[PDB]
Design a protein around this ligand. Structure first.
Ligand SMILES: *[C@@H]1O[C@H](CO)[C@@H](O[C@H]2O[C@H](CO)[C@@H](O[C@@H]3O[C@H](CO)[C@@H](O)[C@H](O)[C@@H]3O)[C@H](O)[C@H]2NC(C)=O)[C@H](O)[C@H]1NC(C)=O
Ligand SMILES: *[C@@H]1O[C@H](CO)[C@@H](O[C@H]2O[C@H](CO)[C@@H](O[C@@H]3O[C@H](CO)[C@@H](O)[C@H](O)[C@@H]3O)[C@H](O)[C@H]2NC(C)=O)[C@H](O)[C@H]1NC(C)=O
Ligand SMILES: *[C@@H]1O[C@H](CO)[C@@H](O[C@H]2O[C@H](CO)[C@@H](O[C@@H]3O[C@H](CO)[C@@H](O)[C@H](O)[C@@H]3O)[C@H](O)[C@H]2NC(C)=O)[C@H](O)[C@H]1NC(C)=O
Ligand SMILES: *[C@@H]1O[C@H](CO)[C@@H](O[C@H]2O[C@H](CO)[C@@H](O[C@H]3O[C@H](CO)[C@@H](O)[C@H](O)[C@@H]3O)[C@H](O)[C@H]2NC(C)=O)[C@H](O)[C@H]1NC(C)=O
Ligand SMILES: *[C@@H]1O[C@H](CO)[C@@H](O[C@H]2O[C@H](CO)[C@@H](O[C@H]3O[C@H](CO)[C@@H](O)[C@H](O)[C@@H]3O)[C@H](O)[C@H]2NC(C)=O)[C@H](O)[C@H]1NC(C)=O
Ligand SMILES: *[C@H]1O[C@H](CO)[C@@H](O[C@H]2O[C@H](CO)[C@@H](O[C@@H]3O[C@H](CO)[C@@H](O)[C@H](O)[C@@H]3O)[C@H](O)[C@H]2NC(C)=O)[C@H](O)[C@H]1NC(C)=O
Ligand SMILES: *[C@H]1O[C@H](CO)[C@@H](O[C@H]2O[C@H](CO)[C@@H](O[C@@H]3O[C@H](CO)[C@@H](O)[C@H](O)[C@@H]3O)[C@H](O)[C@H]2NC(C)=O)[C@H](O)[C@H]1NC(C)=O
Ligand SMILES: *[C@H]1O[C@H](CO)[C@@H](O[C@H]2O[C@H](CO)[C@@H](O[C@@H]3O[C@H](CO)[C@@H](O)[C@H](O)[C@@H]3O)[C@H](O)[C@H]2NC(C)=O)[C@H](O)[C@H]1NC(C)=O
Ligand SMILES: *[C@H]1O[C@H](CO)[C@@H](O[C@H]2O[C@H](CO)[C@@H](O[C@H]3O[C@H](CO)[C@@H](O)[C@H](O)[C@@H]3O)[C@H](O)[C@H]2NC(C)=O)[C@H](O)[C@H]1NC(C)=O
Ligand SMILES: *[C@H]1O[C@H](CO)[C@@H](O[C@H]2O[C@H](CO)[C@@H](O[C@H]3O[C@H](CO)[C@@H](O)[C@H](O)[C@@H]3O)[C@H](O)[C@H]2NC(C)=O)[C@H](O)[C@H]1NC(C)=O
Ligand SMILES: *[C@@H]1O[C@H](CO)[C@@H](O[C@H]2O[C@H](CO)[C@@H](O)[C@H](O)[C@H]2NC(C)=O)[C@H](O)[C@H]1NC(C)=O
Ligand SMILES: *[C@@H]1O[C@H](CO)[C@@H](O[C@H]2O[C@H](CO)[C@@H](O)[C@H](O)[C@H]2NC(C)=O)[C@H](O)[C@H]1NC(C)=O
Lengths: 347, 109, 108, 347
């Protein structure tokens, strides 16, 4: 440097000519760069992650005019960012899906390329319709030729997915076993995703490809509301589907000191699985809710079966003074909590 | 006081208090005249002690954009029939009594 | 016309409307029970047709800091005595009637 | 340049050597600059407006080390900004008051200077206590010596100011003559300030210095609410005092259709001088104000006699429905306005 590259001015490495990356990794001058122009070379056929071996914040990469034809799903793995990728005027027969893996790439130039249209390009298909990566204007067409951004459409799809929960209910300390059936034709990788099951003993690897077996043993109540997801990746794209478990345990309940806000409110917190049905008592007898005295639930919080709310009293008087009892019932039985409330002194 | 409702609940812009008023002796009628309020009344042979449901400010309002507005809470009224006195005239007249506490808005600058 | 008051006066956060209701026939008592309201009453003499002073919300609230609060106007009530039919006999009972229009806050 | 000046580099004219201004206004190089360093120079005794003749945008001016004995109250007339002025280590016997003339001058160095303590230095005096121009830290003292930022104090004063309006009230189309008597022992310039008296014929110059005559002839009413101020500058500071005329015209009144805000309001506007007394009538008979029905005025606007307000009704009923008359009275007679208002129907 200078010898065959490094001109530009800012964070740019410019080598618009024959390949010479053999020593541009050992002692190039700066692993940092932002633009790489390689729109001209004689070699470059197999582009792998090694060819990019070098941490860098690059936003523009030009590999048009070259010889590349097989880009294995990995490559740009390094450059976390990347907004514009120009691979135009090359030999690349097809560009694997996984390549982009949502890198926020804003512009992707693929063209004058053989671009044999396969199912393994439905993704660029989408990208054209959806008008995402600035694919539209380019007017891409197929090699051999069955010409272009037209294309059999229904004959390419993502894999299908159903996951069978145990048909019977569940109770704490059981074994919950289940399979994830991926039904399609592309057929590549698969594997579950556990969103932190620190409270249960999971047992996977019980499957190959037609099905993936996952079993949770000696199951704690802390399984509730924890998505249990599974993978699927055809030759073009990915589908994840996720289900849940629902382990049951007895009702618990508590009431808080009545508080006057816009309306009066007797706050309550109730848990239990199955979720319990609620009923109130006023001085030991059934309290029928009205438009002025009724139960109101706050919005359920993220992954926690506990519910909060109030017995709301719209302008209650001294005739409403008394003992309020909340009864939470489920299969296991019933929990109860009482509290005295005075809303106004009597005459 | 760690209950979610203390945070996600529906609050009043102005806080009030409600009480039964039974010692009321004077009041002002629909004409704005200071009249006497009796303590009992005879509704169909049934002697009644005169009582009133009154709501008043709990002594700027909550949630107001104080950058742009001056504001305060104040007690508003309602008119209710009551056995009163104007001379030797015990009558069934409407009087002014506390019924709510509202927020009064006022532009600043 | 343009008068300084439309800018410098004291406004309501919620707009209401007061009217005189004399065709009331039902209402809910203090026990939240639905009760019948007598059209008339009579004090050891002639009859006074039963009338009620009501204020409800006039068709968020004004001056609310919309960055931290959601809000709405709503009609609140009051308890007023009235000659009613308890579902059994005639009695002087406290019934619920519209009495004001207030603003309700809820965090964002 | 160069030859006896202009080194620096940026916005700067640097001549810390010797007199060379005799031709620094004809062909200097660039009217603009920002810093001038004239520490050290034989000549330059009287600094005047003719010496800075070069419309500049200077923020720093150093005139330390020189003969500079006098600084005509003008000099810095050209330079509008000026934050720092260094006239230190010099031969200044005193610095006129006007000199500064609010330039937001942030720093003023007046040092190693003869600095004989007169009344004309009370301003400096103040700048010290006020702690403003960054005087304090310098420890300035008095020449000949009666030494410092101590000093007879009360014996020094600005001028006193009285303006005798006519004894008798005024009516439109009169003359109004008045005098401004300034008493002090400084004694310099004086003069009235008329802030736009387009509506009247003024005639001043009716005085010298013990008294200043001013007369407003064929007086309109548009003289009202109009400050009429007079000047005064002694050998250290300035005092200006301002009176008002009050000319009288007849009442005028108008009502607007009732509107419902927090309370109901019948908007009114009334004019006149003397200000009229308000009185309401409901259906032709006097309306006694109470805490629920009362008259209310908005804050008075500057430079206007017109008043705005409301007849305020706190929850009126059908019993307040009727014709409202506002009566506005002053010594010329009475103005009247009526309006029909309906706050509620009435079965
Ligand atoms: C297993 O776990 C489920 C967690 O997703 C849970 O489902 C329940 O979800 C809520 C309460 O958690 C309830 O759904 C109702 O749906 C109606 C109609 O949309 C709404 O109007 C109502 O407000 C409420 O959202 C039900 O209690 C239940 N939903 C179902 C599945 O019917 C249950 O604990 C359990 N669900 C299963 C698989 O039965
Ligand atoms: C609202 O009513 C509740 C039931 O009517 C009441 O619950 C409990 O009240 C007290 C303690 O809070 C206890 O009552 C005693 O129970 C023992 C054991 O049976 C008896 O020997 C004794 O005579 C007395 O009844 C109970 O724990 C329970 N009441 C019962 C017996 O059902 C709430 O206390 C009340 N609200 C409040 C706190 O005032
Ligand atoms: C010249 O005309 C002026 C306009 O009519 C008149 O205004 C003044 O009137 C009285 C004078 O004592 C004062 O008004 C009071 O103002 C205070 C608040 O500042 C109130 O609390 C009080 O109730 C009363 O309104 C003011 O000095 C001033 N008010 C006005 C109208 O702005 C002058 O009095 C009159 N003077 C001459 C030269 O005759
Ligand atoms: C497993 O992962 C999450 C539970 O930890 C679930 O999440 C969901 O969150 C809400 C539903 O409560 C939704 O959020 C998306 O949709 C809203 C409204 O359409 C949009 O604002 C935005 O698209 C949100 O991302 C979704 O249902 C879901 N969020 C997403 C997209 O992950 C999640 O649902 C659950 N797995 C599934 C998909 O069943
Ligand atoms: C001529 O110019 C103005 C009217 O046209 C008057 O001005 C003054 O206005 C107010 C009087 O309302 C003076 O007082 C205010 O300021 C003091 C602070 O010193 C506060 O106590 C309070 O805010 C007062 O209301 C101001 O000092 C002055 N305003 C300015 C220009 O700063 C002026 O008075 C008038 N000449 C006269 C005296 O007739
Ligand atoms: C990645 O490299 C691509 C190849 O160089 C480049 O293509 C574009 O090149 C220039 C950009 O200025 C433009 O070429 C046009 O060619 C037509 C045909 O002669 C002219 O009529 C027109 O005036 C213009 O010169 C096009 O924008 C485009 N040309 C093609 C199809 O190669 C990409 O722009 C580049 N990606 C980036 C970073 O934008
Ligand atoms: C106008 O000229 C003033 C004097 O020429 C100047 O005062 C300052 O002078 C220098 C700044 O360059 C500093 O004084 C120094 O003091 C040390 C001793 O501590 C000496 O060793 C050194 O030679 C020099 O004299 C001070 O910053 C200050 N003088 C003092 C100590 O009061 C003004 O700053 C200048 N006005 C401007 C800002 O243009
Ligand atoms: C509420 O009552 C007001 C009476 O004070 C009334 O004022 C006006 O009433 C009529 C129509 O505007 C006019 O009355 C005149 O009265 C003189 C008396 O001698 C007659 O000679 C003349 O023919 C006429 O009837 C006046 O314009 C005025 N009344 C006076 C003189 O005060 C209001 O109009 C009424 N409310 C409304 C606005 O309808
Ligand atoms: C990749 O490297 C740079 C991005 O980091 C690119 O640069 C350019 O960046 C933008 C477009 O991305 C150009 O346009 C800006 O200016 C216009 C004014 O017409 C505005 O609309 C807006 O501010 C745009 O962001 C810039 O002009 C240019 N940057 C410079 C040098 O100022 C660069 O083009 C890209 N390299 C390639 C060609 O692959
Ligand atoms: C006239 O000349 C300049 C006009 O803008 C000013 O100068 C000063 O500028 C800043 C004011 O705080 C200071 O400079 C220091 O900060 C800069 C900015 O980071 C740095 O380059 C370095 O730390 C400087 O020392 C000084 O007070 C002064 N600049 C210097 C060092 O000459 C100022 O308005 C006036 N100059 C003076 C002080 O007479
Ligand atoms: C196959 O191509 C068809 C072409 O229409 C796709 O259909 C969609 O077309 C639009 C999306 O760009 C939208 O109208 C709809 O998403 C959908 N058409 C409708 C309304 O049915 C389709 O999504 C593509 N993929 C497949 C095989 O379903
Ligand atoms: C004269 O200078 C003094 C500084 O000491 C100023 O301070 C005053 O402080 C008090 C005011 O309540 C009193 O002690 C004096 O009025 C005065 N101090 C003295 C004794 O001089 C004072 O404002 C200055 N006087 C002038 C000309 O305004």
């Amino acid at each position: 440097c200078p010898d065959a590259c490094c001109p530009h001015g800012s964070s740019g490495l410019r080598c618009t000519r024959d390949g010479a990356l053999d020593s541009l990794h050992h002692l190039p001058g700066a692993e940092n760069l932002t633009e790489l122009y390689i729109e001209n070379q004689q070699h470059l056929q197999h582009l792998e992650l090694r060819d990019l071996r070098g941490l860098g914040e690059l936003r523009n990469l030009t590999i048009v005019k070259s010889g590349l034809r097989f880009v294995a799903p990995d490559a740009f793995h390094f450059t976390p960012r990347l907004s514009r990728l120009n691979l135009s005027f090359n030999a690349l027969e097809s560009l694997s899906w996984k390549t982009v893996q949502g890198l926020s790439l804003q512009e992707l130039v693929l063209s004058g390329n053989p671009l044999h249209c396969s199912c393994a390009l439905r993704w660029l298909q989408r990208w054209e319709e959806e008008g995402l990566g600035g694919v539209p204007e380019q007017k891409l067409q197929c090699h051999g030729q069955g010409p272009l951004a037209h294309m059999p459409n229904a004959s390419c799809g993502v894999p299908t997915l159903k996951v069978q929960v145990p048909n019977a209910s569940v109770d704490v300390g059981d074994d919950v076993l289940l399979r994830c059936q991926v039904e399609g034709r592309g057929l590549e990788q698969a594997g579950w995703i556990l969103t932190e099951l620190e409270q249960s003993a999971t047992v996977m690897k019980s499957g190959g490809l037609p099905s993936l077996g996952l079993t949770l043993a000696n199951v704690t109540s802390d399984l509730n509301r924890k998505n249990v997801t599974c993978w699927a990746e055809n030759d073009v794209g990915r589908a994840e589907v996720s289900v849940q478990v629902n382990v049951s345990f007895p009702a618990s309940v508590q009431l808080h000191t009545a508080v006057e806000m816009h309306h009066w409110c007797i706050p309550f917190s109730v848990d239990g699985q199955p979720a319990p049905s609620l009923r109130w008592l006023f001085n030991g007898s059934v309290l029928n809710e009205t438009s002025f005295i009724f139960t109101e639930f706050l919005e359920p919080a993220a992954n926690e079966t506990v519910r909060h709310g109030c017995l709301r009293l719209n302008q209650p008087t001294h005739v409403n003074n008394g003992n309020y009892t909340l009864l939470a019932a489920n299969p296991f039985g019933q929990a109860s909590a009482s509290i005295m409330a005075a809303f106004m002194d009597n005459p | 006081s760690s209950h979610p409702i203390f945070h996600r609940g529906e609050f009043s812009v102005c806080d009030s208090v409600s009480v039964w008023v039974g010692d009321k002796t004077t009041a002002t009628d629909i004409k704005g005249k200071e009249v006497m309020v009796l303590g009992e009344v005879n509704i169909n042979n049934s002697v009644f002690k005169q009582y009133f449901f009154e709501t008043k400010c709990r002594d700027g309002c909550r949630g107001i954009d104080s950058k742009h507005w001056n504001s305060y809470c104040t007690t508003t009224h309602t008119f209710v029939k009551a056995l009163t006195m104007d001379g030797k005239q015990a009558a069934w007249r409407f009087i002014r009594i506390d019924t709510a506490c509202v927020c009064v808005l006022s532009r600043k600058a």
